[PDB]
Design an enzyme around this catalytic site. Structure first.
Site, mmCIF file in Angstrom:
data_model
loop_
_atom_site.group_PDB
_atom_site.id
_atom_site.type_symbol
_atom_site.label_atom_id
_atom_site.label_comp_id
_atom_site.label_asym_id
_atom_site.label_seq_id
_atom_site.Cartn_x
_atom_site.Cartn_y
_atom_site.Cartn_z
ATOM 1 N N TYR A 48 8.676 12.146 8.088
ATOM 2 C CA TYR A 48 8.984 10.943 7.322
ATOM 3 C C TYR A 48 10.285 11.001 6.554
ATOM 4 O O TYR A 48 10.677 9.984 5.980
ATOM 5 C CB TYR A 48 7.849 10.631 6.339
ATOM 6 C CG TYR A 48 6.549 10.663 7.066
ATOM 7 C CD1 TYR A 48 6.128 9.557 7.794
ATOM 8 C CD2 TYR A 48 5.769 11.823 7.095
ATOM 9 C CE1 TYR A 48 4.963 9.580 8.499
ATOM 10 C CE2 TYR A 48 4.581 11.859 7.807
ATOM 11 C CZ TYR A 48 4.191 10.733 8.506
ATOM 12 O OH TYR A 48 3.026 10.735 9.219
ATOM 13 N N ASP A 75 0.876 -1.160 0.000
ATOM 14 C CA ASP A 75 0.000 0.000 0.000
ATOM 15 C C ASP A 75 0.916 1.212 0.000
ATOM 16 O O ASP A 75 1.357 1.649 1.071
ATOM 17 C CB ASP A 75 -0.932 0.003 1.215
ATOM 18 C CG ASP A 75 -1.906 1.189 1.217
ATOM 19 O OD1 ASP A 75 -1.710 2.139 0.425
ATOM 20 O OD2 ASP A 75 -2.879 1.167 2.008
ATOM 21 N N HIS A 135 0.012 18.229 8.786
ATOM 22 C CA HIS A 135 -1.372 17.858 8.556
ATOM 23 C C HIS A 135 -2.266 18.471 9.625
ATOM 24 O O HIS A 135 -1.813 18.790 10.731
ATOM 25 C CB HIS A 135 -1.525 16.337 8.539
ATOM 26 C CG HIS A 135 -0.751 15.650 7.452
ATOM 27 N ND1 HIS A 135 0.542 15.202 7.627
ATOM 28 C CD2 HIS A 135 -1.098 15.302 6.188
ATOM 29 C CE1 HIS A 135 0.959 14.613 6.521
ATOM 30 N NE2 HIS A 135 -0.014 14.662 5.630
ATOM 31 N N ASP A 165 2.564 19.985 13.319
ATOM 32 C CA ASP A 165 2.575 18.980 12.260
ATOM 33 C C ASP A 165 2.071 19.620 10.960
ATOM 34 O O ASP A 165 1.357 20.628 10.978
ATOM 35 C CB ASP A 165 1.678 17.794 12.660
ATOM 36 C CG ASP A 165 1.793 16.596 11.716
ATOM 37 O OD1 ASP A 165 2.541 15.658 12.062
ATOM 38 O OD2 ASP A 165 1.125 16.566 10.645
ATOM 39 N N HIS A 188 -4.891 12.704 14.281
ATOM 40 C CA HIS A 188 -6.007 12.411 13.399
ATOM 41 C C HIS A 188 -7.061 11.515 14.032
ATOM 42 O O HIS A 188 -8.168 11.419 13.482
ATOM 43 C CB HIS A 188 -5.473 11.784 12.118
ATOM 44 C CG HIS A 188 -4.561 12.706 11.372
ATOM 45 N ND1 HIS A 188 -4.814 14.058 11.260
ATOM 46 C CD2 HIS A 188 -3.376 12.493 10.754
ATOM 47 C CE1 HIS A 188 -3.828 14.636 10.593
ATOM 48 N NE2 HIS A 188 -2.947 13.708 10.271
ATOM 49 N N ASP A 213 6.898 16.607 9.811
ATOM 50 C CA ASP A 213 6.636 16.639 8.387
ATOM 51 C C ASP A 213 6.450 18.059 7.871
ATOM 52 O O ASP A 213 6.288 18.239 6.664
ATOM 53 C CB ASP A 213 5.427 15.768 8.027
ATOM 54 C CG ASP A 213 4.244 15.936 8.974
ATOM 55 O OD1 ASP A 213 4.169 16.904 9.761
ATOM 56 O OD2 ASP A 213 3.354 15.083 8.898
HETATM 57 O O1 LIG Z 1 1.657 12.463 9.131
HETATM 58 C C1 LIG Z 1 0.489 12.383 8.956
HETATM 59 N N1 LIG Z 1 -0.387 13.117 9.869
HETATM 60 O O2 LIG Z 1 0.049 13.879 10.989
HETATM 61 C C2 LIG Z 1 -0.102 11.637 7.731
HETATM 62 C C3 LIG Z 1 0.691 11.345 6.629
HETATM 63 C C4 LIG Z 1 0.173 10.717 5.499
HETATM 64 C C5 LIG Z 1 -1.175 10.402 5.445
HETATM 65 C C6 LIG Z 1 -1.754 9.691 4.207
HETATM 66 N N2 LIG Z 1 -2.409 10.577 3.252
HETATM 67 C C7 LIG Z 1 -2.572 9.907 1.958
HETATM 68 C C8 LIG Z 1 -3.711 8.867 1.921
HETATM 69 C C9 LIG Z 1 -5.214 9.164 1.940
HETATM 70 C C10 LIG Z 1 -5.987 7.944 1.893
HETATM 71 S S1 LIG Z 1 -4.983 6.670 1.823
HETATM 72 C C11 LIG Z 1 -3.544 7.436 1.858
HETATM 73 C C12 LIG Z 1 -1.985 10.706 6.537
HETATM 74 C C13 LIG Z 1 -1.456 11.328 7.663
HETATM 75 K K LIG Z 2 -0.941 20.828 12.315
HETATM 76 ZN ZN LIG Z 3 1.497 14.910 9.649
#
Ligand SMILES: O=C(NO)c1ccc(CNCc2ccsc2)cc1
Ligand SMILES: [K+]
Ligand SMILES: [Zn+2]
Ligand SMILES: [K+]
Length: 639
Positions: free
Chosen positions: A307, A22, A176, A174, A137, A267
């Site tokens: 990452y 994946d 996101h 972060d 999240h 990130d």
């Molecule tokens: O670091 C993070 N959050 O703090 C983080 C990083 C990457 C993702 C994936 N996003 C792509 C996706 C959408 C449906 S499947 C794959 C989510 C959260």
């Molecule tokens: K944030």
């Molecule tokens: Zn993030």
């Protein structure tokens, strides 16, 4: 008072991973934790922190933030084979499960609660938890975005319950949006949530309308949710610092939290494939430093994302360096935030103007990838040297010290022969002191800063300034609290002068910032508005090699001097010399404390600043922001 920094980590949390292909989930790997801890060991930082053991969050603690139905479902994943783990993961968005992730999720949450307890019990000043899986999240009844349980939300709810805290600030840097945290607290006015995040007009994951700036909270919580969307990638140190000076910090210092929790995903750093931003690892030393005067320094940093294994290690170190009190790196090349960021900042400031005093004036028209390795950050052997009036010993922190060589006395004699005639052999001792103190600050990595009491201001400033310039320190920032003219030349871009005074003097040119605030009960909030909105943006862009602080003998701002002294050490690697005109035991002891890295007493919420003061401050911004673009918090008019 508390001391030390906790570091909470367990290699068990690296013992789950993705078991099927994946490419969307490929990036959340166990090595994020190993690389980050190994980088802290390599730099001697893990060894300087109190290791505090991991534990499991209990069922009752998980239920503070999650539903029984969700907990019961996750509790079954240890018994699932791979097929069943794949089918279970696909009920959620961008998350994978592993036989050991439930175990690790309980450790990541307990680790976070361990950190809260150590800080709130005053066993450490602050700390960091390196945990996996991330949290922000996560939602009441769902896993999301590699998160199983909401580590940071836990910490705030747990701290509310067990320490009866009324105000908690969560800073989510972060890249996101931490929507789990926003949902959890959107109606709670006791938790203030700030998040910046890659958004791109809602085209970036998680693609949510309520990640925009217009989400301010709901009901009793209106104004305690602050979203700053990034609508382009490639944001830089200047964008992040502009976000702090013009959105987050003005609100955080007014809210006056009792505890600070950081959702610290890296990130948002240069090199990361999810964020695609351009901020250097060194910026996290300053994001940490700028928040440390809050809540008497009680700050819980908890890892979320990041990452790029290289930038991950470096930003974790910069953060812990700052938690340990080490001198911050110099940030060069700062300027205006870009147009997209200025639009986001202007939009959030406007929508929040209904709820926060620092934005209130906006509401009425009457007032409206490779990059250089980070340098080393060795703490000074003795951080602060002090020179009180002769024969005045005082209780100093364990890392301070009192102060005249033969070489120095020759220089003082030289200087007086040419430039001064004067023979008061006391203010001549002052000059040997200033010079001895300055030479230790600059020639030595073993002294970081110092404070000197002096009699005569003009000769004091001249020798301090001239000895520093002709040393050579390229740029000197001078911060003067007092009236009158000093022997300072703003003639070139080697000196910037901030002056805080009591008579409204016209401002000549763009290398002087003169703040005359009306004296009264509002003087304290006004000073803080100027510090965060004017002084710090200019100083950070100026990027001095030394800071010279000067207080003339007159009291009125004995309450804000420690905040300024702490924050101003973000410049010049903390190298600051303060000249106090005349002995004042409280101001002297306050100065040495903040210079030495001690925690600063909270201001409390203060009386909102006088509109006349805000008018004065925005006239200063208008006058200076073409030269000093980090002062901007609106988009500029195009021709
Ligand atoms: O670091 C993070 N959050 O703090 C983080 C990083 C990457 C993702 C994936 N996003 C792509 C996706 C959408 C449906 S499947 C794959 C989510 C959260
Ligand atoms: K944030
Ligand atoms: Zn993030
Ligand atoms: K809230």
């Amino acid at each position: 008072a508390a001391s030390g920094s906790a570091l909470i980590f367990d290699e068990e949390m690296s013992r789950y991973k993705l078991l099927w292909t994946d490419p969307e989930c490929e990036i959340e790997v166990p090595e994020r934790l190993t690389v980050s801890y190994e980088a802290l060991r390599t730099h001697g930082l893990a060894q300087r922190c109190k290791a505090v053991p991991v534990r499991q969050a209990t069922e009752q603690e998980i239920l503070l933030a999650h539903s029984e139905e969700y907990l019961e479902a996750v509790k079954q994943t240890p018994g699932m084979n791979v097929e069943e783990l794949m089918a279970f993961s696909k009920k959620y968005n961008a998350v994978y499960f592993h036989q050991n992730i439930y175990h690790c999720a309980k450790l990541a949450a307990g680790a976070t609660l361990q950190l809260v307890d150590s800080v709130m019990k005053r066993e450490v000043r602050n700390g960091m938890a390196l945990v996996r899986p991330p949290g922000h999240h996560s939602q009441r009844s769902a896993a999301n975005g590699f998160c199983v349980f909401n580590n940071v939300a836990f910490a705030a709810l747990y701290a509310k319950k067990n320490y009866n805290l009324n105000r908690i600030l969560i800073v989510d840097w972060d890249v996101h949006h931490g929507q789990g945290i926003q949902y959890c607290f959107e109606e709670d006015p006791s938790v203030l949530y700030f998040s910046w995040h890659r958004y791109e007009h809602q085209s970036f994951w998680p693609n949510l309308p309520e990640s925009d700036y217009s989400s301010v909270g709901k009901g009793k919580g209106s104004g305690f949710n602050i979203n700053l969307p990034w609508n382009k990638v490639g944001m830089t140190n200047s964008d992040y610092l502009a976000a702090f000076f013009h959105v987050l910090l003005p609100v955080a210092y007014e809210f006056d939290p009792e505890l600070v929790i950081v959702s610290a995903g890296f990130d948002s750093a240069i090199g990361d494939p999810e964020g695609e931003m351009c901020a250097l690892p060194e910026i996290f030393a300053h994001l940490t430093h700028l928040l440390m005067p809050l809540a008497a320094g009680k700050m819980c940093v908890v890892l979320e994302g990041g990452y790029n294994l290289t930038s991950l290690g470096q930003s974790v170190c910069q953060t812990v360096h700052s938690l340990l009190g080490d001198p911050t790196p110099r940030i060069s090349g700062l300027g205006t935030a870009c147009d997209s960021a200025l639009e986001s900042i202007q939009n959030v400031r406007n929508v929040q103007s209904s709820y926060w005093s620092s934005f209130k004036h906006l509401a009425q028209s009457e007032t409206n990838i490779v990059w250089p390795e980070p340098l080393k950050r060795m703490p000074a052997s003795v951080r602060t040297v002090v020179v009180p009036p002769p024969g005045v010993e005082l209780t100093l922190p364990k890392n301070c010290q009192h102060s005249i060589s033969e070489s120095t006395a020759k220089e003082v004699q030289r200087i007086r022969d040419k430039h001064f005639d004067l023979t008061d052999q006391n203010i001549l001792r002052s000059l040997g002191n200033i010079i001895s103190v300055l030479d230790r600050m600059m020639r030595s990595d073993e002294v970081c800063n110092g404070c000197v009491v002096v009699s005569d201001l003009s000769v004091s400033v001249q020798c301090a300034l001239q000895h520093a310039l002709t040393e050579p320190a390229e740029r000197v920032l001078v911060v003067y609290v007092g009236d009158g003219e000093l022997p300072v030349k703003t003639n070139d871009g080697k000196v910037f002068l901030v002056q805080i005074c009591t008579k409204e003097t016209e401002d000549k040119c763009v290398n002087r910032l003169t703040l005359c605030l009306r004296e009264g009960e509002s003087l304290t909030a006004g000073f803080m508005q100027a510090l965060l909105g004017l002084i710090l943006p200019v100083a950070y862009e100026f990027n001095p090699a030394l800071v010279l602080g000067i207080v003339e003998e007159t009291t009125r701002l004995m309450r804000v001097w420690g905040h300024m002294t702490c924050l101003i050490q973000g410049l010049a690697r903390g190298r600051m010399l303060t000249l106090l005109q005349g002995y004042d035991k409280d101001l002297l002891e306050l100065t040495v404390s903040a210079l030495s890295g001690a925690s600063i007493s909270p201001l409390g919420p203060l009386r909102a600043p006088k509109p006349e003061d805000v008018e004065m401050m925005e006239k200063q911004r208008q006058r200076l922001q073409e030269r000093w673009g980090l002062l901007r918090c609106t988009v500029s008019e195009s021709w």
